[PDB]
Amino acid sequence: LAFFRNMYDKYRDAFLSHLNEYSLEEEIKEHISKYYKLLFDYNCLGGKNNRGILVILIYEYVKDINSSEWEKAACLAWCIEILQAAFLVADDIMDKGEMRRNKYCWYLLKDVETKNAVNDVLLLYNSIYKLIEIYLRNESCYVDVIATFRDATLKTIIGQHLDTNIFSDKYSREIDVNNINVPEQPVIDINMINFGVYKNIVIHKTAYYSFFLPIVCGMLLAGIDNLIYKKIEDISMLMGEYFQIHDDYLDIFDSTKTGKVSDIQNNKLTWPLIKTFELCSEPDKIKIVKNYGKNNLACVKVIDSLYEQYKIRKHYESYEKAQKAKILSAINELHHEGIEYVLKYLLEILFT
Amino acid sequence: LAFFRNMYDKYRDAFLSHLNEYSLEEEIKEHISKYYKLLFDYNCLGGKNNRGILVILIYEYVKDINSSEWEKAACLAWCIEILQAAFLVADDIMDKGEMRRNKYCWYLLKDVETKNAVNDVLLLYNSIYKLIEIYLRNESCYVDVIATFRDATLKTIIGQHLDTNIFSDKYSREIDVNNINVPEQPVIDINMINFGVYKNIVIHKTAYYSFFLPIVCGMLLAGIDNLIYKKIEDISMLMGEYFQIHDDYLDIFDSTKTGKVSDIQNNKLTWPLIKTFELCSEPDKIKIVKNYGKNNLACVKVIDSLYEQYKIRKHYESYEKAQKAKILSAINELHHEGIEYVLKYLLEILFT
Ligand SMILES: CCCCCCCCCCOc1cc(O)cc(COc2cc(Cl)c(S(N)(=O)=O)cc2C(=O)O)c1
Ligand SMILES: CCCCCCCCCCOc1cc(O)cc(COc2cc(Cl)c(S(N)(=O)=O)cc2C(=O)O)c1
């Protein structure tokens, strides 16, 4: 079952040995494999592996499975860990990040820098489909597996776009393709602070690839199309909202435990923000507008101090409990003991 | 035939309405479509469309074509034009470009910056595979087409990696995962200034997606695996070299015609550099090492002086004629009239 962590070496080396079939001077090949080995190890290891665990479990509890068929599923499982590694490198470039899984972000290393990092997220991304071909080309589900990766990816790209631009000038007129020189001054848009817009962003940014895709993958590989998928997809949207709100909470509340340091500085629409904005006073809205989305520690400190004043922790647990219950309620209306066993177990182990 | 200029709006709108049926608010939906309309139009238009045209021609000259079949072939043609959109957004980030196709580089605009640009190369790259599916799900060549796009993209990712790092320290060691502070100053490595290495870089960075892929897509659609594909691969390699070397020679010899600003400044391994290193005395080798790769006006003027002095235009004319001959010679060993003509057309229209 969770031996999964051991087959990592063979899926990474399967792809490295494909690179090594290229017509290149033997000296270049040694430099190529040395660089890309560190690219895969540095950025795929060190996670909780929840999304990969999720595939292996759904595969087993939809359900007698020989060792040849566990190889195909462990490949899907690592393909989703690779997929998150490629999201991490991109996010850390995009969000001017500093620390990830308690190491320097990949793009900050002066031996790689941005130029290499941008090129590396596309290598990692494409390595997924190569692994999928190498291990599943002859399955009946091959075309649908790669269509689920492609479509889940598209959705989280759109979700990443919204997360980055929800507050920007071009969403409050016309993109000026002649301005390379007046850098927009980031500012909140009070008209966008609400949960309708939050769920739109976070469903797309989190729920499809962290939950819909690993489940649907585990089920396409087992043999299932059926009207159960749409019920799985609704639970997914609930677990994605529930996971992202927890992630927003962690951003402001310990880097040693989370492994990261940024949402106020980066002018993001977050749960702590929409919470504060509905309960605070009219003076307090003016301070939020004035200080949100700057790099001043003084401006961040103002926003953090407001989050304590209004005790947003207490509100979080209120949300967490009510939502945990809404997910369990949604799992039980699914009518499938095996998959219901995986989702409940996952719901317990999501943050550990 | 070359009417495929007219079909752009429908393949672009095809992808845009895939996004437009996402579960998002109505106001959010229209912001997305306004931004991604400009994304496609800014970066797929304004080029010469040599790769797109090559697909349409090869398809027609391997053969009797109905309207439905043209709608598929012109999809593959814009897919490769979108592919080259993604390759620019990315090449211009990594090389800090200023002008691409007589406009500002996409990442340089203040409404997009680097954070949106990185996210946009993944959207453009992935939109290709949505388009191929919409129009080719039910064709027998469908899987062969998606795999050709994938293995081509992988090779140019590797070539672009070598092009970026052949002169850096890690290619002369190991990567310091502790260094985020001491930046690497760009320098020349004389062990890498040879045509063996350059052919490795250029073939991967250019030959596969610029030639092999658009030709293979044409043939696959036409129904042909066969040993002719191996012959197309070596032609492709001779034409990739030919085309990059011409590009190199234009970098020193006007943004009116080329549409872009920089190889000396940017420490690039180019054919002028390699040739000049063969012909020159070793006191001039020392000048090169001292002046190449410096963001300094005196320094590129010294390297320019050296290209003029060792008569680089005269040697480019020689190379160009001998290489053109060897490509025509390979073309004739094809033993297929329709492709031979297209490759003769292409070899004449390459710079126009
Ligand atoms: C294949 C990439 C194609 C281009 C994609 C560009 C957009 C990528 C967007 C990824 O978006 C994210 C948004 C977020 O709010 C957070 C994250 C990161 O979430 C994490 C979640 C988990 Cl469970 C874990 S883990 N592996 O330590 O257990 C890690 C991350 C993480 O950032 O490391 C990514
Ligand atoms: C799907 C992208 C995944 C990440 C890829 C990162 C690396 C992208 C590398 C693209 O590599 C190139 C290498 C080169 O030496 C040159 C180029 C561009 O060359 C051009 C040649 C021509 Cl004829 C033309 S055009 N369409 O304007 O008539 C354009 C390009 C081009 O710059 O667009 C791209």
Coordinates of C-alpha atoms and ligand atoms in Angstrom, one line a residue, chain A residues 46-51 81 83-84 86-88 90-91 94 100-101 121 125 153 156-157 160 163 205-206 209 243-244 247 260 350, chain B residues 118-119 122 126, ligand 1:
Chain A
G46 CA 9.9 16.5 1.3
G47 CA 6.1 16.7 0.8
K48 CA 3.3 15.0 2.7
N49 CA 2.5 13.1 -0.5
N50 CA -1.2 13.4 0.3
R51 CA -2.2 13.6 -3.4
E81 CA 3.7 14.5 -7.0
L83 CA 2.8 17.8 -11.0
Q84 CA 2.8 19.5 -7.6
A86 CA 6.0 21.9 -11.0
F87 CA 3.3 24.0 -9.4
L88 CA 5.6 24.8 -6.5
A90 CA 6.1 28.2 -10.6
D91 CA 4.3 29.5 -7.5
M94 CA 5.3 34.0 -9.2
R100 CA 9.6 25.9 0.5
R101 CA 9.6 22.6 2.4
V121 CA 8.7 23.8 -14.6
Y125 CA 5.4 19.2 -16.4
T153 CA -4.0 21.5 -15.1
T156 CA -5.5 25.4 -11.9
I157 CA -3.8 27.7 -14.3
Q160 CA -3.7 30.8 -10.5
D163 CA -5.5 34.5 -7.5
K205 CA -6.6 26.8 -7.9
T206 CA -6.7 23.8 -5.4
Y209 CA -5.6 18.8 -8.9
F243 CA -7.9 22.8 2.3
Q244 CA -7.2 26.3 0.9
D247 CA -3.7 27.1 4.0
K260 CA 7.2 28.5 4.1
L350 CA -5.2 16.1 5.4
Chain B
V118 CA 5.2 32.3 -16.5
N119 CA 1.6 31.3 -16.0
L122 CA 1.7 27.0 -19.4
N126 CA -1.7 23.4 -22.7
Ligands
LIG1 C1 2.7 22.4 -14.0 C2 2.7 23.9 -13.7 C3 2.0 24.6 -14.8 C4 2.0 26.1 -14.4 C5 1.2 26.2 -13.2 C6 1.2 27.7 -12.8 C7 0.3 27.8 -11.6 C8 0.8 26.9 -10.4 C9 -0.1 27.2 -9.3 C10 0.0 26.3 -8.0 O1 -0.8 26.9 -7.1 C11 -0.7 26.8 -5.8 C12 -1.5 27.7 -5.0 C13 -1.5 27.7 -3.7 O2 -2.3 28.6 -3.0 C14 -0.7 26.8 -3.0 C15 0.1 25.9 -3.7 C16 0.9 25.1 -2.9 O3 0.3 24.1 -2.0 C17 0.9 23.1 -1.3 C18 0.1 22.1 -0.8 C19 0.7 20.9 -0.1 CL1 -0.4 19.7 0.5 C20 2.0 20.8 0.0 S1 3.0 19.5 0.6 N1 3.6 18.8 -0.7 O4 4.2 20.0 1.4 O5 2.3 18.4 1.4 C21 2.8 21.7 -0.6 C22 2.3 22.9 -1.3 C23 3.5 23.6 -1.6 O6 3.4 24.8 -2.0 O7 4.6 23.1 -1.4 C24 0.2 25.9 -5.1

